[PDB]
Amino acid sequence: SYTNSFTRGVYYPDKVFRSSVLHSTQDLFLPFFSNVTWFHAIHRFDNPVLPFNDGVYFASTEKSNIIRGWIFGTTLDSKTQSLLIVNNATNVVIKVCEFQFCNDPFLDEFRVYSSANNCTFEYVSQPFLMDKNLREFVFKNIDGYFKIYSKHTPINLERDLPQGFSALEPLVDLPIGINITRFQTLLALHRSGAAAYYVGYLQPRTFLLKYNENGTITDAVDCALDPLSETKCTLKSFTVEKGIYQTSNFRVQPTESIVRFPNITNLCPFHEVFNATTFASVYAWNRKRISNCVADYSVIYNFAPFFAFKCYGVSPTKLNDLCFTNVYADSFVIRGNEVSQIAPGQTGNIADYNYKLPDDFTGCVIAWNSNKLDSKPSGNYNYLYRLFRKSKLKPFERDISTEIYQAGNKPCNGVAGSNCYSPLQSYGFRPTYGVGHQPYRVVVLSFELLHAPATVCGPKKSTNLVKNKCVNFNFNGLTGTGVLTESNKKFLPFQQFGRDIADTTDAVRDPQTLEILDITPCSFGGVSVITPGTNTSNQVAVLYQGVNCTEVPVAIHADQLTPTWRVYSTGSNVFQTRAGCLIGAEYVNNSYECDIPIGAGICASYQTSQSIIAYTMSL
Amino acid sequence: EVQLVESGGGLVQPGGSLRLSCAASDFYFDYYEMSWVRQAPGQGLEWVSTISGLGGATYYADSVKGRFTISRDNSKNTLYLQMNSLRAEDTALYYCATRSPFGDYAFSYWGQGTLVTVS
């Protein structure tokens, strides 16, 4: 039997406390006004085991505890663990053990399973999972926690599914995650009765959940219903005003996320320039260029954290995701007084005649005290720094010219006497020194991200390349959403002529294999939604800018959608305009004052019963 | 603050190599990377190769791997490009662009470019 789910199945996505907010989540939910299976029971069964796709929305209106739990499993024949739940008189067991569920799934006293040899985690939870009244449960496995929800609500008189929102309160998260692809409803019988339960399947869809001040949910939108629902999930509100609005790609509702970030697995030798035997001096910094690596910055801050870990340009944390093309590691040792002068824009002693950072710098500088290893009884005399010069060094310059600085009228010829000195100075690192004289070893990491195949990326995992399907792609930092198609382009274009301010990515390259993949919009065409206001009515209209009333079914891919949208995106009283094709109105041949502008002078409103009409501008 | 004039590539024949020069008048940044950008009639523009300004490591494209070579001379601040085995896909306009390694992908200096036709 088939029925309709009247906006039921909205649970709490996470456990974070939220109040008086509107949160847009992207978890698995039950679509509103979907087709649920109303499976009845007679007394051995009426239907075989149902396939578990993403989640199960179980509902029951019977009483006397006929439906006494549930049974899960993949093949149920000595292959994997089976999630068994049975509600006893007061207690309930959630024993996930190897069970041989036969063709007799009856309880009344255990006859559902045949035997059990290898039993995994078992729960002895005391609160029973049983309590007319509608018993709403939402079972969903997220590969590590099998979230089960429940909402006990007294049902109405002579009805099956009430007309009212009821959010399911979350329960404990059971540690599961073994493969589950099928679901079956467990039933009981006094003497070898009848029952009936609703079953629905969850899909990945966005949801705008509204939390009030008390911390409860009162209304939600599936973001996959009629264009009013998409308008509801693009303005972050529940009271759409009387006016034409836009929407986003909430139609196809992508379900997969592809990463494909890295290409190699060899760790980077970042523990080779931070713990060297003898760091370079100030006048000659040993720059090390590194490419074809793995940008694993987890070993940097977890290395007895140092002082002044100031990362410019990029964020200090969340660096294990953004991938660059090369990393330049400079390392030297200075005094404690000018440990902050090595920064973009700073000016001083080591920022004028020594290593200087550029104005725009997307690297990070980190220094650490070395008053225990870089210290001598009479002070270290090996380290040197330039202090007497005349040419301001440009960013990323090295000057190893040990020639005698000319400062007098007559040539010094190396005597370094009156009015003539040496550019280098041996500042000793005496132990008995203040904070402004302690030796600090400083390492600067410059991140070069050029228009070249990125080599040193983060430790992010590698997903599978699923093409010809609306997915969210994060190939090499380009986080977008679209359909990946196999194009026939020679080389990836580099759009830099008009600076591409209001532009988007058209094609990308897989970092693993060199294949130019074109990115197409899953559903677009300038979809404008004409709304007269939620306070007035609930009838809307659609406008597709760039069609001729015939290319609209193939533009938005009206093949796998809701049956409530095919009435506003088909040949139902269409009207071709100079801007597009208005579907969902009736063009009148009268003259009225102008109203909500649909496009190209066309004004429309909602009146007479009253319905959405359209008329040209009455000049 | 200035422009980068180009010369060299005029009319060539299938099979050979011609030098492409890129000069600079008031350019003194020793860390800004310099690259070549090819644009063929019809489809958009593509990337040939680039030189890392922070060091001396050059990065070429996939089609120009074992046939192109770039060189940077800081004495007179010039860029030289030598392209070998120009069979059929080297008929385009080449631009000598310069951008900063730390920033966006968009270049910071647009040159005049020279048209090379392999016929």
Residue that is written with structure tokens 């009162």 in the block = A218
Q: Which of B28, B46, B59 sits opposite A452 (nearest CB)?
A: B59
Q: Which long-range contacts (CB under 8 A, 24 or more apart) does B88-91 make?
A: B88/B14, B88/B118, B89/A490, B89/B40, B89/B63, B90/B116, B90/B118, B91/B40, B91/B41, B91/B116, B91/B117, B91/B118, B91/B119
**A229 sits in which H/E element:** helix A227-232
| H helix intervals, chain B | none
Residues 6+ apart with CB under 8 A from A534: A228, A238, A239, A240
C-alpha A11/C-alpha A224 separation (Å) is 17
Structural domain range at position A603: 225-253+522-619
User: Are A153 and A35 in the same domain?
Assistant: yes
**A334 sits in which H/E element:** strand A326-335
Q: Which of A452, A489, A494 sits opposite B45 (nearest CB)?
A: A494
List A29's β-bridge partners, or say none.
A203
C-alpha B46/C-alpha B68 separation (Å) is 15
Contact assignment for A358 to B55 by CB distance below 8 Å = no
Closest by CA to A447, choosing from A317, A573, A569, A311, is A311
Q: Which of A397, A447, A449 sits opposite B30 (nearest CB)?
A: A397
User: Are A282 and A363 in the same domain?
Assistant: yes
Q: How many CB atoms lie within 10 A of CB A391?
A: 9
Q: Tell me the shortest Cα–Cα distance from A497 to chain B, in angstroms.
A: 8
C-alpha A82/C-alpha A73 separation (Å) is 5
Task: Say which DSSP state A419 is in.
Answer: T
C-alpha A288/C-alpha A304 separation (Å) is 23
Pair A613, A541: CB distance under 8 Å: no
Residues 6+ apart with CB under 8 A from A159: none
Q: Which of B54, B89, B100 sits opposite A328 (nearest CB)?
A: B54
User: Are A566 and A479 in the same domain?
Assistant: no
Count of CB contacts below 8 A, A vs B?
A: 86
DSSP for A110-121, written as a single string: --S----SSB--
Pair A574, A546: CB distance under 8 Å: no
- What residue ranges in A449-563 does DSSP mark as E strands? 470-474, 479-486, 507-509, 516-520, 527-532, 541-545
Q: Which residues of B touch A (CB under 8 A)?
A: 28-31, 33, 35, 37, 43-47, 50, 52-55, 57, 59, 61-63, 89, 100-103, 105-107
Kindly report the backbone phi and psi dihedral angles of residue A576, in degrees, each rounded to the nearest multiple of 5, phi listed first.
Answer: -80, 130
* C-alpha dist (Å) from residue A439 to A333, A339, A370, A445, A594: 7, 9, 5, 20, 76
Kindly report the backbone phi and psi dihedral angles of residue A552, in degrees, each rounded to the nearest multiple of 5, phi listed first.
Answer: -75, -40
> Three-class SS of residue B97?
strand
Number of domains in chain A: 4
Q: Tell me the shortest Cα–Cα distance from A411 to chain B, in angstroms.
A: 27
Per CB-CB distance under 8 Å, the chain B contacts of A361 are 102
Antiparallel, parallel or unpaired: β A470-474 and B45-51 = unpaired
Distance linking the first and last C-alpha atoms of chain A: 56
C-alpha A611/C-alpha A605 separation (Å) is 9
Nearest CA in chain A to B111: A497
C-alpha A555/C-alpha A524 separation (Å) is 7
Contact assignment for A447 to B102 by CB distance below 8 Å = yes
User: Are A199 and A313 in the same domain?
Assistant: no
Q: How many CB atoms lie within 10 A of CB A154?
A: 8
Kindly report the backbone phi and psi dihedral angles of residue A389, in degrees, each rounded to the nearest multiple of 5, phi listed first.
Answer: -140, 175
User: Are A193 and A88 in the same domain?
Assistant: yes
Q: Using CB atoms and an 8 Å cut-off, which of residues 310-339 of chain A contact chain B?
A: 313, 325-326, 328
Residues 6+ apart with CB under 8 A from A542: A227, A527, A528, A529, A530, A568, A569, A582, A583, A584
User: Are A332 and A425 in the same domain?
Assistant: yes
Q: Which amino acid is at B84?
A: N
Residue A443 tokens, joined: 């390492």
Pair A20, A59: CB distance under 8 Å: no
SS in 3 state form for A37-95?
EEEEECCCCCCCCEECCCEEEEEECCCCCCCCEEEEECCCCCCCCEEEEEECCCCEECC
Closest by CA to A580, choosing from A531, A539, A527, A522, is A527
Q: Which of B29, B54, B105 sits opposite A448 (nearest CB)?
A: B54
> Three-class SS of residue A196?
strand
Nearest CA in chain A to B39: A493
Q: Tell me the shortest Cα–Cα distance from A407 to chain B, in angstroms.
A: 26
What CATH code is carried by the domain that includes residue A268? 3.30.70.1840
Residue A516 tokens, joined: 């130019």
Q: Which of B30, B100, B106 sits opposite A499 (nearest CB)?
A: B106
C-alpha A253/C-alpha A29 separation (Å) is 12
Q: For chain B, list the domains and their CATH numbers.
A: 6-104 (2.60.40.10)
Nearest CA in chain B to A496: B106
Task: Say which DSSP state B65 is in.
Answer: T
Buried b (16+ CB within 10 A) or exposed e, B63-93: ebeeebebebeeeebebebebeebeeebebb
User: Are A299 and A442 in the same domain?
Assistant: yes
Q: Tell me the shortest Cα–Cα distance from B101 to chain A, in angstroms.
A: 5
Q: Which of B31, B59, B105 sits opposite A395 (nearest CB)?
A: B31
Diameter of chain B by CA atoms?
40
C-alpha A516/C-alpha B69 separation (Å) is 25
User: Are A201 and A276 in the same domain?
Assistant: no
Q: Of A461, A478, A498, at which residue does a domain stop?
A: A461
Q: Tell me the shortest Cα–Cα distance from B76 to chain A, in angstroms.
A: 17
Contact assignment for A450 to B61 by CB distance below 8 Å = no
Chain B touched by A122 (CB under 8 Å): no
Q: Tell me the shortest Cα–Cα distance from A514 to chain B, in angstroms.
A: 9
C-alpha A343/C-alpha A357 separation (Å) is 6
Contact assignment for A287 to B54 by CB distance below 8 Å = yes
User: Are A289 and A146 in the same domain?
Assistant: no
Rg (CA), chain B: 14
Contact assignment for A448 to B102 by CB distance below 8 Å = yes
Contact assignment for B102 to A362 by CB distance below 8 Å = yes
Buried b (16+ CB within 10 A) or exposed e, A504-527: eeebbbbbeeeebbbbeebbbbeb
Pair A34, A200: CB distance under 8 Å: yes
What method was applied to determine this entry? cryo-EM
> Three-class SS of residue A230?
helix
Residues in chain A: 619
Nearest CA in chain B to A489: B43
C-alpha A421/C-alpha A427 separation (Å) is 15
Residues in chain B: 119
Q: Which long-range contacts (CB under 8 A, 24 or more apart) does B110-114 make?
A: B110/B3, B111/B3, B111/B4, B111/B5, B111/B6, B111/B22, B112/B3, B112/B4, B112/B5, B112/B6, B113/B6, B113/B39, B114/B6, B114/B7, B114/B8, B114/B9, B114/B10, B114/B20
Q: Which of A396, A450, A494 sits opposite B31 (nearest CB)?
A: A396
Pair A238, A580: CB distance under 8 Å: no
Closest by CA to B37, choosing from B103, B98, B100, B119, is B98
Closest by CA to A453, choosing from A286, A263, A313, A253, is A263
C-alpha A551/C-alpha A304 separation (Å) is 62
Residues 6+ apart with CB under 8 A from B96: B4, B6, B20, B22, B34, B35, B36, B79, B111, B113
User: Are A236 and A354 in the same domain?
Assistant: no
Nearest CA in chain A to B54: A396
C-alpha A439/C-alpha A371 separation (Å) is 6
Most A CBs within 10 Å: which of B77, B102, B104, as the mutation test of the A interface? B102
* C-alpha dist (Å) from residue A46 to A1, A49, A197, A198, A556: 11, 10, 12, 13, 39
Pair A306, A445: CB distance under 8 Å: no
Pair A169, A89: CB distance under 8 Å: no
Q: Which amino acid is at A325?
A: T
Residue A80: alpha-carbon gap to chain centroid: 31
Q: Tell me the shortest Cα–Cα distance from A547 to chain B, in angstroms.
A: 26
What CATH code is carried by the domain that includes residue A58? 2.60.120.960
C-alpha B63/C-alpha A455 separation (Å) is 18
Residue A150: alpha-carbon gap to chain centroid: 27
User: Are A233 and A216 in the same domain?
Assistant: no
Per CB-CB distance under 8 Å, the chain B contacts of A494 are 37, 44-47, 105
User: Are A301 and A420 in the same domain?
Assistant: yes
C-alpha A166/C-alpha A505 separation (Å) is 41
Nearest CA in chain A to B107: A496
Q: Which of B44, B46, B102 sits opposite A361 (nearest CB)?
A: B102
- Count, in order, helices (H) and strands (E) of chain A: 3, 39
C-alpha B46/C-alpha B34 separation (Å) is 15
Per CB-CB distance under 8 Å, the chain A contacts of B95 are none
C-alpha A224/C-alpha A564 separation (Å) is 9
Pair A398, A347: CB distance under 8 Å: no
Per CB-CB distance under 8 Å, the chain A contacts of B37 are 494
Q: Which amino acid is at A173?
A: D
